[model samples]
Target chain A: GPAKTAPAGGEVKRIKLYAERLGGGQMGYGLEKGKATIPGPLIELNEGDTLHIEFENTMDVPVSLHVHGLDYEISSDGTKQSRSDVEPGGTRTYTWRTHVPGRRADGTWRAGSAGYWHYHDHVVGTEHGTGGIRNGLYGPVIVRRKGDVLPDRTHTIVFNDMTINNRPAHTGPDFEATVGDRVEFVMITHGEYYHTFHLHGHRWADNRTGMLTGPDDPSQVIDNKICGPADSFGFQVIAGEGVGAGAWMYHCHVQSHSDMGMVGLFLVKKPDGTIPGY
Target chain B: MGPAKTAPAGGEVKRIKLYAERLGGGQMGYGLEKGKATIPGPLIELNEGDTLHIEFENTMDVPVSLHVHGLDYEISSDGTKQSRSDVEPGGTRTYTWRTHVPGRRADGTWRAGSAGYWHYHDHVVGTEHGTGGIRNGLYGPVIVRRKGDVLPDRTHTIVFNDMTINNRPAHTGPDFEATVGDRVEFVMITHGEYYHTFHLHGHRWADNRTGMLTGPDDPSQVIDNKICGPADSFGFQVIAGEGVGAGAWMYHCHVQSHSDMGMVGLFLVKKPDGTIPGY
Candidate 1:
């Protein structure tokens, strides 16, 4: 059930995303589901979908869910003084109106629209803004266009406090794919550490797709590019294009982070290209 | 001085012997010749197609290996776990490599080779992906240039070592200078814990070729601002004082707290006659 599209006419979809500390002494803060991950589960949807998110603050202190690039009302701002924040064990529902790309009468998005955005805690920084993320309260919100081709597989890699996806490099689950399939990566960061996502073999053209704008448009067409805290960028590549069928390494180029654990692998199976267990 | 010429077929090869040293500043680093050890090691420069012979000696108690990024190499020369490299203390390994020259394809796409800003670091004592010895100070820049690419009159490598620019606090590192018509290039690399976006107050490249406001792409789509991650690098050229005249322009990391913590510096462009303001 990945990359689901919303029904036409913008139906209001309700979701329960609880923010709390799991009962069994989990490693870090997490959304409900009994597990704590540096980057919470991905919230994927299509453009024009309205979401009613029921957020439960189950931590010891007051917490709030603040989104990075979604359209929400002032009442749902989730700022500290907005009074929209919920106390421990308390709950608050955030109403967000997601948008899509369309030319305005004069040709411009009414409000700058969709791509990969993010959501994090709003009440934890120095003056009430960074602590939540420091504790690992963040995730990706991918809003796709109606007819855009979905990737065969998507991996939302988050860099938090030198750790990636809440685990040390080489410790996270391996990403599997068939040789001919397309793989997409949405990289986001939530800590002070700077990181770059680099894949061996194939290169990403833009911060978005494997396709180049023109023959000579050399924007982000390389094996490595940058990603920063709260910064969300994406790239797609065929499983095994120029360099074929093997276990390709993907990791944070920041030597320190990779040394610490911000690394993982993308296994591309050859000869009829299929992942055995996946 | 700038991008040098490739050594003729049987010509003299550039040789450098690097030593991995333990220094007194609470830091472990690599040095060119013993007491001259620096955090970033020594800058490795070469002309496209030039052969470099480097002899590395591990002086510290632990083992170490050197790895180069953005260069083509066989698995044996890849410098990682696969290489099984552990140049033991007092051990030496000689690395001989030939650089590549970049060229444009018939379709106009730029084919990759060397001829760009690359980096090198220690890849020993850990898996292929770990930081290993780089965190301490075992890294430096590797630059390979193509022939007739119009070398810059001035070059500055801004390494974001945490919140400091090359170990100096904001406004403390060396200020870059150039004449109005001189072409200047800024090579930005990152290190340490956080990410940074390099922004120049009055300079940006429209097509990665020149810092002109007008170009084929979106005229406003200049790369004056770019985000860089640790181990990532990007370099662009700008015609100094391109109608903007001489002045102290700020070039800095745009992250609020980072800039506040001293990741900033100045780029001073001189007059057309090549004179400073006081002069």
Candidate 2:
């Protein structure tokens, strides 16, 4: 069977999310109480889908959910709600709407909302959610278009401040894969610093999908890319496509930043279920 | 895949003379003709498969070199201290840069072409990496176009060099102007420390090679703001006041502190009658 692809979206989905403290002043969002993790959870949707997140704040501070590259009314906007944040022990419903690309009446094209986006707390610490973001209240949002290629597995790499996925240095929340697995990555950046995301032995076309659409596509193929705060992009690669089965490295190319521990490993195993040199 | 303009085919071996001189007041620059140097040396344009030999003369009292990005050059033209290619004071060296068209290797993997928004700069100034050289204005833009790429009416360069636009004082309007409907191209380059989000008011471009949309099938995101770090460069062309009318449009660093500290300029779009709306 051809790997399953995204269905034509137009469905309305609802889920409950929670905000809670993680001790040591850290915080996160989770689908259930007492289970919040740093960097939150991955929210996936398809083009033309609507998501209603019944968000609850169990913490003592004001928090709200804000998203990027989606359609939402002011009431759902995360920043302007600085005056009306989800209070401690309060609940709020945030609706995010998506639309398909099409030509307008005047014939100009409007881009769709099928992008690798992100969501984070908007009214914590400072007006810009500086404290909330610094405390790990962020997550990834991926909206796929109909017929978009699906991946065997997906991973998120967030360069927040100086940490990768809010983890300590050198110790990687390493990812494992087998050769020929069509793995995807949703890379996002947040917090105060800038970084160049580099993946050794792998590269992707710098298009919206990261993969080349066809031989005629003119997207640049790059292994390293510079990114800054609030920026997000995603791409998929076949595990050990050309360079088969090894501990491939992925990290911030900024030498100082990498030395300080902003790196991780993509452990690819051979078809025989073993990795050489390991 | 649409009706597109084309640049002339390459495969030409061209040679040019470039002079590097200390422009007093602690600034250095590259110029085609001596005594007419500019902060951004000169617009070095090439088509795929083209070759350019730059006979560089270093008239400054210190050692300098010419280094390029996104092109094919051997160690002799590496233009770095490691390769001992830096030109000494009053020294001369010929740096050859060659480009190639995209093709498929015998291994069946595809190779990207040498057409992109690249740059060149000094690589042997104060520090081994030319920290002092770039900080003191020693960089410029290099653009390589592929055949059939859309040509622009005018080309401009913007280097966010250390909190200043083109190494000039802040807010001094190194502004660019164009008439409505004219195709205007910009090469935005960043240097020195700190990253910046280059933003243009009321305009956007696809984040892909050639910047223009590769038609409706292309899925590149069209963005008005882009984040870039030191040594990063990209280019795009926009129809002057395409949907937005002519006016004193502003372009600036979207970084809070950087923009506030003077990394701003204007895109002066005027009507056919040579008038701007409200300024």
Tell me the whole-model lDDT of each prediction, alpha carbons only: 0.65, 0.84
Scored against the true structure, residue B81 in model 2 reaches a CA lDDT of 88
Cα lDDT of model 2 by residue, B1-279, tens digit: 123356878999989999987886899998998897889889999999999999999998899999998899999999998999999999999999999999999999999999999999999989999988888788989999998787878999999987889998877858999997777899999999878878775466777777766557886865556898799999998767754567776677755455546677889888899997656
* Docking level for model 1: incorrect
Q: Give the TM-score of candidate 1.
A: 0.50
Per-residue lDDT for A1-278 in model 1, tens only? Answer: 55433343356788887776643432234446566565777777766888899877767778777665565644465655446677888888888776643333322112222456667776754323456666677787776656545787788878775777666456965788878777878777655656777887778765333446466655556788665556666667888897778888888887877787778888889877654444
Judging by TM-score against the true structure, name the best candidate: 2
TM-scores for the candidates = 0.50, 0.61
* DockQ of structure 1: 0.04
Model 1 stretches with alpha carbons more than 4 Å out: A1-9, A23-36, A103-112, A125-129, A209-218, A271-278, B1-279
Clashing pairs for model 2 are none
Error of 1 at A81 (Å): 3.0
